[PDB]
Amino acid sequence: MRLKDLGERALLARLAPLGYPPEAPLPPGDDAGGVWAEGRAWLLKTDGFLYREVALKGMGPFEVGFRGVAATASDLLAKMGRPLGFTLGLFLPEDLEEGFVLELVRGAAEAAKRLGAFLLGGDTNRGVEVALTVSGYALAEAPLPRKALPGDLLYLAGDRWGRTGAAIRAHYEGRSLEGFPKIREAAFYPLPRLELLALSGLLRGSLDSSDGLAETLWQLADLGVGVEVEALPLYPDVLAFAGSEEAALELVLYGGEEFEAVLVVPQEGAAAVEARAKAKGLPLFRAGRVVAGEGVYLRGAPLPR
Amino acid sequence: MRLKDLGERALLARLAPLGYPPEAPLPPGDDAGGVWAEGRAWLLKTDGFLYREVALKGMGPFEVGFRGVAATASDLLAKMGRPLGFTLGLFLPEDLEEGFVLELVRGAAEAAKRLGAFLLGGDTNRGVEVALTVSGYALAEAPLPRKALPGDLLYLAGDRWGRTGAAIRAHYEGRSLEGFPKIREAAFYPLPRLELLALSGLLRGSLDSSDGLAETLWQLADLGVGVEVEALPLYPDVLAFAGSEEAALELVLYGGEEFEAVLVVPQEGAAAVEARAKAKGLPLFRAGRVVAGEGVYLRGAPLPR
């Protein structure tokens, strides 16, 4: 079967276990992969993309490089790994201007610096179209896998929910983001949250949302549980942009590229976690909880994948 | 200035220090990059390439995936890092058969397994042409930077010298490798050389020859020294394939893709190094020495880069 008909989800599921370590700190198909080395869970993650598929109107190579590192760092942080460094794989057309490449690299270096991390080099190769892969490694004291048990609460960390969806929709509709700076920042400089690490060792599991929250909630449900969302964050700017509560909901659920984490919090320490996040400046939103059975629900109604 | 006019060396040289750590276990622009973490030098490296640039006649996706890991692993090993895992970044045209992709990943997984390493996942994306990047991390107890002092001896480790160049030349000339099994193996399955680690903590420096021996020797000279090559290994099969000493030397010096290390050994430790290599199964060849000054010479004659 050709990739077109196969689909990305099916292909990824088939490739996930190949060569994966049997006694790993994280299961196959998680937000990152890794091995146990001298008492620490060393994580490794590679994210790739075509320049023309991530660069929204107003974004230049600087923003693209910055987002590449941010994307990879977010997956590592959701697994409770502290990103230490990143490497770049670049495919560049021969007629590309060197200034363009310098911008891509400085953008990436800037995102790395904000995290206290570095660029450890990379590689460049001739290519037909500008394409890039960003890999990063992280040291995790308590690796957080995608796991959940009926009874645990579901929390949304960070504040890019609905905003990255708005930015993409604006880009597709040809609408300006003048008047929506937080939405623009969410798309141009999505800062991965080191504060997530304040919750290391306290959570049951997590999933990084890069392909939409609804899609992520179903990835959680597919673990073998039911998901009941009682509330979702609808930021004032997201509502203004959307025009209605219903329109804002679609941006929040079917937006994408949020690179914010969905956290599975055991009822036991839910009070502490809120306190911890609060104490460390980590935005936290209680969305719902995990239950026995299957399916994903939004206030009782079925939430479509 | 266009990339085509700038050159790979010039470009890479400009990007190398960008975002690199000031207290790193390896200098910027080395065979790999890394940071010191809890007493160990953790190295990270990315090697990318286009499928068509690597696939020689007779090679399929399994061999290409194997070589991607072999290459990344070789750079890490030259720095004395023990490779622990790799991640893949794949760019794939939508009309590709799924089996082709499965071969790529299994090939990579095979090379990783030979090293006692694993595949930790990766990412896939649509592309106009098959392109791949392999990233890997390694734990180095004693990171080995590219470093050299006048009086130091130059050794070549491994046995792919001249053979990878012969394979490439064969492909270009449409010449059969029937009767040249070692040359074919050097191109199809360049086994990553774990035995290099037997020399951990004994050498002054090293460089991995991924782009040709002469090029690698000039990179060594660019550290601020002169290089005198007194002898080079001309294997029987390389000589037979080449037809003459001259043609053979050209394949050895301007071949490429060897992924074998050039080692800088202190005079005082050479006897011990050779003994250690012999005891642990690491092919080693004494080729010359480092001297004060500049430039690379082959038996007194300037060696073109």
From TrEMBL, chains A, B:
GO terms for molecular function: ATP binding; magnesium ion binding; thiamine-phosphate kinase activity. Residues 29-139 form the PurM-like N-terminal domain. It comes from Thermus thermophilus (strain ATCC 27634 / DSM 579 / HB8). One of its GO terms (biological process) is thiamine biosynthetic process. Mg(2+) 5 binds at D211. Reaction mechanism of ThiL seems to utilize a direct, inline transfer of the gamma-phosphate of ATP to TMP rather than a phosphorylated enzyme intermediate. Substrate binds at E257. Keywords: ATP-binding, Kinase, Magnesium, Metal-binding, Nucleotide-binding, Thiamine biosynthesis, Transferase. It holds the Pfam family AIRS_C. It comes from the Bacteria. Pathway: Cofactor biosynthesis; thiamine diphosphate biosynthesis; thiamine diphosphate from thiamine phosphate: step 1/1. Mg(2+) 2 binds at D47, D75. Mg(2+) 4 binds at D31, D75. It catalyses: thiamine phosphate + ATP = thiamine diphosphate + ADP. Mg(2+) 1 binds at T46, D47, D123. Catalyzes the ATP-dependent phosphorylation of thiamine-monophosphate (TMP) to form thiamine-pyrophosphate (TPP), the active form of vitamin B1. This is Thiamine-monophosphate kinase. The keyword Zinc does not apply. ATP binds at G122, D123, R146, S210. Its EC number is 2.7.4.16. The lineage of its organism: Bacteria, Thermotogati, Deinococcota, Deinococci, Thermales.
